[PDB]
Amino acid sequence: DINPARALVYQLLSSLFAREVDEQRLKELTSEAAQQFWEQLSLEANFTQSVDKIRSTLNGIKDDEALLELAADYCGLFLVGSASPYASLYLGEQHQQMSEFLHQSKLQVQSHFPEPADHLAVMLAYMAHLCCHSENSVQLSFLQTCVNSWLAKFINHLTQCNKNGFYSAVATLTLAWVKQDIAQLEPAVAIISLEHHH
Template identity: 35%
Template structure:
């Protein structure tokens, strides 16, 4: 796989990771509204399998511009979806979806720690979350891509750490995200991981 392709894949994974890691800060919001990100999302929409989800995210960003205090309102959306414990919350952890009891810190968490350690990686101390948080797994996939790790190992991570629970997670987001930004983000994450699996499989 060429260095350019590997770098591009990594950048997409890292960008998607940043969108779900925590509430977006001022710099991230400004970047989200920039012509560069607009062009980036438009380029994604030209890729097979990403057309609908990319356009949905672009529309959601345009709607976000119209909100009175978009930073605070988006932070409230994030907190309601990912930080709460009520019926409107959607846990961004593999353990929640892959353990029979829907508990956190289960086998997927321990498996991700082993994967990180096997490549000499560690999550940032500033990001104090279980290792199977979606943002950490996406960031890890970016590292596998940029390190040009064997396709078999990248496919294994996609299948065992993401694609076995992302469809249900995205469905839950769609049910609970009344505004739609994170719904669009979740659908792009799912579409990209599915498209990436198809790409590296071939």
């Protein structure tokens, strides 16, 4: 009864922390239907001051420089770490419930953080999965596209940071292992193209 309205307020607040505000969003936040909304929210004594600051700011963005500055505030405050909006930086089972929610919603926040699946550990773990669950062509393609395309660089920079050399050796072995695996996969994959063509 009142819940859909509450969901709506939480969504709006969420959107404001999710990512910086672009032209399309600004137009959505300052339209007539949005103006009435902000007014209604302002009627509550505990919300009045905050609602006026938010609404007067958004209504004051008339050019590109105005929108760009607000975004700079967003980036300067949340994408540097500053006041990163992560609970753990200021302070259990309902994190898993959210984990699923995250996976389901396809809702991702603006972030300067590297993509988790871009972690070498993840790529290798996934390749291990491809070895027994995919065609050789998919395995080869993945090694050439996502692994062999950058290890050399990683290794190079690793040799300038690892004094001991343990992890430099691990990286070195990984590339060597990948190259040899690619050489075993090439003919296999090529046989299938010579056969699926004739």
